[PDB]
Symmetry: D4
Subunit: 162 residues, 8 copies
């Protein structure tokens, strides 16, 4: 089945984070593609991918990058699709550089930004699912089940151990 | 003409920022409601608003707050709708507290976070529009017009 | 005996921190309950717990959370009891996100915030004890003994070792 | 009508912030004293104030300071009473220095810390009130009225 | 008199900062062009500008932007010319977002980053001049004069 | 011989840092005492130590603390002697809390602050030595020798190894 | 009446801060010189100043600078005298850049660092005085008077 | 062949970072010298090195330092050559101190600053190469080849592994 979400990331290194987005889309049965696109090393690839995303039938782009993280923003510059950004944790600044480079977009070109790291990747997939669920009742039901199970799995008290 | 986006904000003071979201939705002719809901002062109002949002026909919630900014996250806790969060600039820490308290949601309950301040308010509206445009071709066309005009309007050189 | 302090936390993971609060209340012989309550995954549980805390005889709530840490603040929104907040250390931002999400409450709804991590948990228990000691002379004496022993246990000079 | 809360602050300049605590205690009719005590300029004054607080009948101390803000912590070192700390906004670092020097108390000597600035001053007073309300039913009722009015007073929508 | 340095900036508002680079290049009589190019609003303009820079005879690009400041980095992605980046002071975060989004380029695509604000704009021009001076002896002499006057002009003591 | 520098620290834990100050004073043959004094757990000890320091013949106090680091500042509040502060690296905030708590003293009560961690401890000893060398020619000569050897020990180029 | 403290600063603009050090030394009747020395614009002036300081009879150097603040550290590199550093508040980063570039000296070359801004300038003068007081009993007495008046002058309560 | 780039660093410790600059210049066949120069421990060496750099035929200086990182700026104060600065990652503050000490030069004396750590060192070499390539067609061709290979080496999708 044809992809409706594209997960893009700057590097193989970033996949340790972005694989969490990929897994969650698979769990919710959302067709997607998962690709490497570097804003700095493959800028013409990025332009083409973003320019053509909507005509290819994509509905949401999830983009992950670290450091001077320009991939999500430049993607948004070239597509009218919703673009969700995942800051990848960086070695020295622990993703603070990633976060600010993604979230602080000037008015006019949005990127919906999620938490630094694996939590953010998981939540980008879930936010993408929330978007798609607006027009897909089967998926809406899967997402409601996911959230109900999440709630039901929280115990009343902690386990005490050594 | 029932609302499809809800703009909610913690206080009247936040409206100096969130009015930019309200203005953009109006510009793109997206039916919406603009309300005050405080996570800390009106928590029952928040719970009811978020719980009933989907059945009332809302598709996106835009939530703005400053300081220990809990409104977007708590909204997302009660609805499966996409929730977009706008950090309002705070007096002392200039919205860094707002930003971290909104964006750093643990896995399972997302908030799509935009920039601190007026830029983020405008972008929350535009992100909401981009979501709605997936299903609404007339809106998609207006959004493409908006983006085309934004691009075309940038001057080539600065003025004295 | 019926609890007079409730220790609540967002997750089992948080208990590695919050167990220090639990231990100190036990040392000072303060009856308490220790529970998991997630602001984001069990919001209706949180509302109910906080709403009913005072009628159940609780006097102080100690709440610990990390990241976008909303549990202490939302608890305070629903109870007139004193709520003390413990920022749990987070992976990327080392509890700076936890700290700011808890301490920066707007005027009207307070959370008394303690240090990031285990120190904060211990001190939340001690601050809770200070509050209860205002009306409980036996406990006041135990707390004064605790503080006196603390002072007396500080040596005059350090040990030099390899 | 002997004081049950002590509001202390490092300097006259801090009163622009700590007056909000003073005002709230007066509003709730909580007997209190409002004083200047500097950890660095009047350390003996501080030691004596903190040492004698409990025997004078104080139940809570609210301490505000800015910069390398040591007043709350040093107060807590000398008394078993609950000490609440208000970080005063500083000129250069906007109270981030105040905040860290107050909140990061090592285990054994607590300070319950509130937000930077006027919000924190108000909340220190309200937290003091919530502590006193545990033992004082008339005050508990006034506090519940305060919170009910705060909640009810939030408008439903913003104004132009 | 074809330009050998390109000063580009994200918006008209950035010119309040980047005019200091423009002024310095004029002072040193370095032929240049001063343009607006937005990474986010005019990405195709940016790609074309950067792609063609070397063949048009540019030797250095000075790029200024604020916020999520992507203009310098994306320019460097499309050209082998040296790209110098000026973080423009932003409203909320005072250019800390600008700084990190420009300087933290991963290995393979460099941007030489200067200070936040007007100091950085001036220094980008001077760094461009120091690069051009390697090949242009008349310019090298003017640059040495500039530096000599800067050094000699510092007073020995302050004024009341 | 009677001490002319006092090295004080909040805890045994802090000695892993402050031992570097102790070692350097010993290397430069400066008599000193090395003590534990906690601002928060032994406040009366601190008051007495600082109050009496000058009459005891101390010339400089080096104080090290971490977290909400109040020891150097409260020492300075009670003595007219020069007080030098060493921020001890803290677990979560890596000494940023220590640094700001020490260096940001209001005008009127100074603390000369050195770098976070072991570098700061070493430099507090060296700054203390610089102060004492103003009136002690033998020590001035030892300090000049120390600085000359430091300079002479810097090689011209690095070693390349795996 | 030859100077025993040297106050040096990077620029005329820094004097708005460093004048507070100058004023305090005058108040305590400590002979001093107040000069501009720029690490970046007058590096040879700096090297000569620091190299000759001890033989000219200076006992303490107070050095103030902002931004990438190198003046105190480079002074300490050339003299065995105690060097005290005052971070001057910078426009964008409010002296956080000043602070880190001064305080974070690696082991072997110390700078005693004071607070950002005017507080630090005053405290650098007072720390210099406390150093000189070790050898000068008349000055020690004036310093004790200064501290006694500072302590005694703190009011007991704030004013409306 | 005579050096046209000088790589200088404050310490042997810094070479773990700066060796990446050295390697890249060697890969692009740019003659260079690699030296230790400490701003704080060998200030007269720094003055001389910077003063004489241009007359010796150097075209670019790459300077790396950590902490209170003054080496690049003081080098720039003494030479009209382009000076590129590499912030070395520091223990407590993870190079934030290094970064601000290097990049925040006042107008009049520039340092072109690169990323914290090894990325920055590599990019300082590449920026130096970009500068030299303006007047050296052989090198310009090597640099274009380097960038083309970089682009061509980016795969289209990530590898999934345990
Ligand atoms: K269970
Ligand atoms: K002992
Ligand atoms: K050697
Ligand atoms: K491949």
């Amino acid at each position: 089945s044809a992809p409706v979400v594209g997960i893009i990331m700057g590097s193989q290194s970033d996949f340790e984070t972005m694989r969490h987005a990929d897994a969650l889309l698979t769990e919710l049965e959302i067709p997607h593609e998962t690709l490497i696109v570097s804003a700095h090393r493959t800028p013409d690839r990025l332009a083409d991918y973003a320019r053509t995303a909507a005509e290819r039938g994509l509905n949401v782009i999830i983009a992950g990058a670290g450091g001077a993280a320009h991939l999500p923003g430049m993607c948004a510059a070239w597509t009218r699709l919703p673009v969700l950004g995942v800051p990848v944790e960086s070695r020295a600044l622990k993703g603070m550089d990633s976060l600010l480079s993604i979230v602080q977009m000037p008015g006019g070109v949005p990127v919906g930004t999620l938490a630094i790291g694996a939590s953010g990747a998981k939540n980008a997939a879930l936010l993408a699912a929330s978007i798609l669920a607006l027009y897909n009742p089967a998926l809406a039901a899967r997402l409601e089940t996911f959230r109900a199970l999440q709630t039901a799995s929280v115990p009343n008290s902690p386990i005490t151990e050594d």
